Amino acid sequence: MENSLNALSQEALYKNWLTSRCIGKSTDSERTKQDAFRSASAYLELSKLPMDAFEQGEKLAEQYANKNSQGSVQGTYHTLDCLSLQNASEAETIFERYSK
Amino acid sequence: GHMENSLNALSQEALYKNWLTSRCIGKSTDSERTKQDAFRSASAYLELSKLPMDAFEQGEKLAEQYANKNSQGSVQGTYHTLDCLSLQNASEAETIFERYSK
């Protein structure tokens, strides 16, 4: 696990941290929330980014947790909102600001 | 409409990987609400995929096995969220994708 995590780029660790945080902040389930948050903590430990990437990323993760996208078909799409952080330009611009 | 407008610029591979992760989240969670959310999400990605259905029957297997991976972290508890996100960078996800695109 330590092995697979060490294979990830810094951009991937960050995106995974963002998605994980968003899942935890959106989910109804305390079980799932603490799974999501434990998972976010694992990515965070390996990041070489400074703390402000994560203070700014947390607000983005929360904004995506609350986006409440509606699709054709009634119901929540939080999983989709949270996964969109894998490829969202807002996530990439915070990452770019703090990585070089 | 706007959701698909928003997914239409995503690559076929990124659509497939998000479907995988979404299925994996749904299968691993013990909350029926999180499960239905994840499954509804998965279907949105499915809708824009041009892959044959064999890619999704093979991918479902992969997703359920990642949902049952049960990695242990340095803290006590499940890491299903991390196991499902690992499908975004898994060799297997990419090779299955390639096998059914061309």
Residue numbers in the entry:
A (entry chain A): 20 to 119
B (entry chain D): 18 to 119
Paper text:
We have determined the structures of two members of this family, Rap1b and Rap2b, revealing a new protein fold. The Rap subunit is constructed around a helical bundle of five helices (α2–α6). The Rap proteins display an extensive dimerization interface, consistent with the observation that each Rap protein exists as a stable dimer in solution.
Well-ordered crystals of Rap1b and Rap2b were obtained and the structures were elucidated at 1.9 Å and 2.0 Å resolution respectively. Rap2b has two dimers, formed by subunits A : B and C : D, in the asymmetric unit. The four subunits are similar, with the root-mean-square deviation (r.m.s.d.) between superimposed Cα atoms ranging from 0.5 Å (subunit B and D) to 0.7 Å (subunits A and C). A disulphide linkage (Cys54–Cys120 in Rap1b, Cys41–Cys101 in Rap2b) tethers α2 and α5 together. The Rap1b dimer uses almost 24% of the accessible surface area of a subunit in formation of the dimer. It is possible that such a basic crescent, if present on toxin-binding Rap proteins, may contribute to orientation of the partner during binding; conversely, it might contribute to the lack of Ssp binding by Rap1b and Rap2b. Additionally, Rap2b shares slightly higher sequence identity with Rap2a (23% identity for the mature proteins) than it does with Rap1b (20% identity).
